[PDB]
Design a binder for this molecule. Structure first.
Ligand code: SAH
Length: 238
């Protein structure tokens, strides 16, 4: 066992101490921890997401990831030589798992930081070639503001989000049509940091992207229903 490797005993001990995991943890063919009942609602193919991300942003060498959870997408993005990733995560318990993942895998081109995207001054972060914003936009109170924050630091966003499939009866805030609800996402460790969230209807999601500066929007995937809809878009700004 190479001197750079964490002992399997320590991998096991720390993985167990870090339970409960959301997406589980396996290394060297050993399943140390299982994920949650609703982990299926989150990224389960980080390698495929990273491929799609780098198809969209082939030149990217400095990437910002928002809502890094247990570091699965962070690690997949970091496999590339010549890239550096900053992953922001709002829940300390999740961040500790992501930090463990990076240590086990020796992923030295990753930095992870605790941060609340609703209050962070994004102008302190520097510039990024692109922002990964997956599974997060429906966990904040003012989603349009998170998109503006991405545009403050980058000209590219890979956005995976839900939106609400109807406009009738929605509230209005900053001119956007919003479904304002208590934060009750089925996965407790995926929840936002406010008591409430606002979902957008489709028109308001696209307006919010445009108003942030992401004026070219490519739809990679969309699933529509009357209520919860899913979309993956690449937004590009001037
Ligand atoms: N205000 C906030 N600031 C920072 N992280 C937040 C946040 N609100 C929610 N999060 C984090 O964002 C993640 C949402 S779940 C999505 C995880 C991952 N991006 C994926 O696509 O599968 C969780 O790790 C959650 O703790």
């Amino acid at each position: 066992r190479g001197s750079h490797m964490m002992d399997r005993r320590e991998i096991q001990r720390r993985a167990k101490e870090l339970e409960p995991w959301v997406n589980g943890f396996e290394f060297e063919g050993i399943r140390y921890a299982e994920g949650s009942d609703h982990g299926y609602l989150l990224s389960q193919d980080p390698a495929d997401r990273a491929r799609a991300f780098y198809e969209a942003f082939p030149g990217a060498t400095r990437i910002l990831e928002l809502g890094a959870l247990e570091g699965a997408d962070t690690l997949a993005l970091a496999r590339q030589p010549g890239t550096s990733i900053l992953g922001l995560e709002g829940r300390e318990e999740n961040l500790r798992r992501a930090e463990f993942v990076m240590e086990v895998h020796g992923a030295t081109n990753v930095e992870l930081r605790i941060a609340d995207v609703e209050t962070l001054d994004f102008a302190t972060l520097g510039r990024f070639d692109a922002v990964l914003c997956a599974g997060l936009l429906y966990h904040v109170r003012e989603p349009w503001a998170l998109l503006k924050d991405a545009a403050r630091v980058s000209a590219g966003i890979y956005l995976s989000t839900h939106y609400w499939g109807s406009s009738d009866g929605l509230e209005t805030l900053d001119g956007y049509s919003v479904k304002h609800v208590r934060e009750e996402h089925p996965e407790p460790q995926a929840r936002g940091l406010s008591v409430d969230v606002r979902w957008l209807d489709r028109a308001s999601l696209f307006a919010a992207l445009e108003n942030a500066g992401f004026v070219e929007i490519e739809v990679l995937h969309e699933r529509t229903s009357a209520e919860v809809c899913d979309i993956v878009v690449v937004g590009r700004a001037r």
